[PDB]
Amino acid sequence: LPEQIDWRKKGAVTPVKNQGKCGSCWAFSTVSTVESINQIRTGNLISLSEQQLVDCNKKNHGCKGGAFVYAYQYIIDNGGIDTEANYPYKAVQGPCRAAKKVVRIDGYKGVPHCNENALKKAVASQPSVVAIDASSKQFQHYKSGIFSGPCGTKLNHGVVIVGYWKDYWIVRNSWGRYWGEQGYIRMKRVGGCGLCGIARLPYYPTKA
C-alpha cells in the first residue's frame, strides 16, 4: 500500500461544499464518496445532489439526521442520483422532485470496526465515509495543523476520508471553505477506534 495518498490530487474529489444550517451531513458525506468512485471508475468528475437525498430519502430525516446505510441503499434502489446543477441544495427539506439518474452505484461495503489498518487499505482504493464525535469545541473551532483531540467516541457527525499520511487522515468536512484548512482537517492516526472514534463505522460505495 502507498505510504501516502490524496484523492484530491488524483482528480477524484469535487470542490468543498457547505451544508449550512441543515443537519444533512449524512447526505454530503455519502454523496461525496459516490462522486469519487464514479470518477475513479469512469474518469468523469461530476458534482451530485445532496438535496435529492434530503428530500427523497424517506428512511432518513432530512435536516434532522440520517444513516449512511439508508443513504447508499436509497441511491441503489432509486436507480441513481441527479446532479447538483439539476437538483440544487436549499439547506431545507422540501417536496421530493422527479430526478434524472445520472450516476449509479452497485452496492456498498463496511470496513472492519476500530481497525485503522483495514481503513487504510480501504482509503487506498477509494474515499470512504466515517462517523466521528464532533461535539468538542476544539474540533468545532479547528483551523490548521494536525488535530489530536480532545474528543470522545460518541458518533454524531459524518465526514469523508479522502487520503492519508503516515501520521494522519485527510478528512473532508461539509462546513464550507472557511472552516479548518480550506474545508479539510488532518486527524492524527492513533489506532484503536481512532481519534474522535473515526475508525468506528466506515463504509464505501462499490461500482463494477
Swiss-Prot record:
PROSITE patterns on file: THIOL_PROTEASE_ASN, THIOL_PROTEASE_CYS
Does the keyword field hold Lipoprotein? no
Keyword Secreted carried by entry: yes
GO terms for MF:
cysteine-type endopeptidase activity
| Taxonomy, superkingdom | Eukaryota
Annotated disulfide bonds: 22-63, 56-96, 114-193, 151-196
Notes on activation and inhibition: Activated by thio-specific activators such as cysteine, beta-mercaptoethanol, DTT and glutathione. Inhibited by the thiol-specific inhibitors leupeptin, iodoacetamide, PCMB, NEM, mercuric chloride and sodium tetrathionate. Repressed by the active-site-directed cysteine protease inhibitor E64 (L-trans-epoxysuccinyl-leucylamide-(4-guanido)-butane) produced by Aspergillus japonicus.
Instruction: Quote a single Gene Ontology cellular component term.
Output: extracellular region
Q: Name one GO biological process term.
A: proteolysis
pH dependence, per the record? Optimum pH is 7.5-8.0 with azoalbumin or hemoglobin as substrate. Active and stable from pH 2.0 to 12.0.
**Tissue expression remark:** Laticifer.
Q: How does activity depend on temperature?
A: Optimum temperature is 50 degrees Celsius with azoalbumin as substrate. Thermostable up to 70 degrees Celsius.
Q: Which residues form the active site?
A: 25, 157, 173
The subunit field of the Swiss-Prot or TrEMBL record says: Monomer.
Describe the function of this protein. Cysteine proteinase. Hydrolyzes denatured natural substrates such as casein, hemoglobin, azoalbumin and azocasein with a high specific activity. Has little or no activity against synthetic substrates.
Q: What is this protein called?
A: Ervatamin-C
The species this protein was found in = Tabernaemontana divaricata
